[PDB]
Design an enzyme around this catalytic site. Structure first.
Site: not given
Length: 344
Positions: A32-34, A37-40, A55, A151
């Protein structure tokens, strides 16, 4: 001793050139994405057929900064139980013991996209009412636990096609910009901050949903803030006295003074209730700005308001190690204990 738990319970698969090791119940892992701090991946829980997000932490033990952030993230996700706040369905490591602990995974509800992917489009007011109502419920909740986002931006608000909303990435601010969602007191540090730092961000996001345009966009924040304050005016001497800096004092004094705020020139198409809420959230004085609980009572939200959904945390968020320095190994040991004692 020797054990077959891992080999029976887990399988290995390359996803996006990264090695994933997953429990057998989570199938068809899809990139899905990056981030840093991690990837999903999304995956299917084969027990139910339902989609989840998983994640994989990215080398969480490469440094103390990464390890401490992974710890604090895990603690936050475990603590929060609210529909508009991303939380944990599961955490696991393939490792059978601390000795062998190098990798871990967070399992979360799957959300198709985030508001950043939709920005630029003009939202109808009923969609704004529903989405901003959910943002505030989520903020009321984390704020009640003693946690602030600090944030908040469209990228941090996960959404699906039904306009369900979850807040991501809260409580981690203490752990490149052309569109500015942070509170002015945070960007310019000209005043004491409180939890309404996040309410300013909601205002900026709501402004952008209404008009299709980023409220504060450009290279230099103060120049973009000025453009708005020239149209809107500033508060008087009770505000100026709170400023921690005489250069900030001169800046405010040089702007038009306006007794009563009127966002009519700023947002000509905004409905009266929309504009009134915007005025009270986009408020320079941190003691005058609405809290989340106050903003939830605004007549803008009447079509969707259900006071029962507006919950608070049962307990404060407890992180005794927030300001501590430990070695990577000590952070790892603290994380490991938190994974082992997790229960849904």
């Amino acid at each position: 001793s020797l054990s077959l738990i891992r080999k029976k319970g887990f399988y290995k698969q390359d996803v996006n050139k990264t090695a994933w090791e997953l429990p057998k119940t989570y199938v068809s892992p899809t990139h899905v994405g990056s981030g840093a701090y991690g990837s999903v991946c999304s995956a299917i829980d084969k027990r139910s057929g339902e989609k989840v997000a998983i994640k994989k932490l990215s080398r969480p033990f490469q440094s103390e900064i990464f390890a401490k952030r992974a710890y604090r993230e895990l603690l936050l996700l475990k603590h929060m139980q609210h529909e508009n706040v991303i939380g944990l369905l599961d955490v696991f490591t393939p490792a059978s013991s601390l000795r062998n602990f190098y990798d871990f995974y967070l399992v979360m509800p799957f959300m198709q996209t985030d508001l950043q992917k939709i920005m630029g489009l003009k939202f109808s007011e009923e969609k704004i009412q529903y989405l901003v109502y959910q943002m505030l419920k989520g903020l009321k909740y984390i704020h009640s636990a003693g946690v602030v986002h600090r944030d908040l931006k469209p990228g941090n608000l996960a959404v699906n096609e039904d306009c369900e909303l979850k807040i991501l990435d809260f409580g981690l601010a203490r752990h490149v910009v052309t569109r500015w969602y942070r509170a002015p007191e945070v960007i310019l540090s000209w005043m004491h901050y409180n939890q309404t730092v996040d309410i300013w961000s909601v205002g900026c996001i709501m402004a952008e949903m209404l008009t299709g345009k980023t409220l504060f966009k450009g290279k230099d924040y103060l120049d973009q803030l000025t453009q708005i304050l020239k149209v809107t005016g500033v508060p008087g001497t009770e505000f100026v006295q709170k400023l921690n800096d005489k250069a900030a004092k001169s800046y405010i004094q040089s702007l038009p003074q306006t007794p009563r705020k009127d966002f009519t020139q700023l947002f000509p198409r905004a409905s009266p209730q929309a504009a009134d809420l915007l005025e009270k959230m986009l408020e320079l004085d941190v003691d005058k700005r609405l809290t989340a609980a106050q903003a939830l009572t605004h007549p803008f939200f009447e079509p969707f308001r259900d006071p029962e959904e507006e919950t608070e945390a049962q307990q404060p968020f407890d992180d005794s190690l927030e300001h501590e320095k430990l070695t990577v190994d000590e952070w790892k040991q603290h994380i490991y204990k938190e994974i082992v004692n997790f229960s849904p």
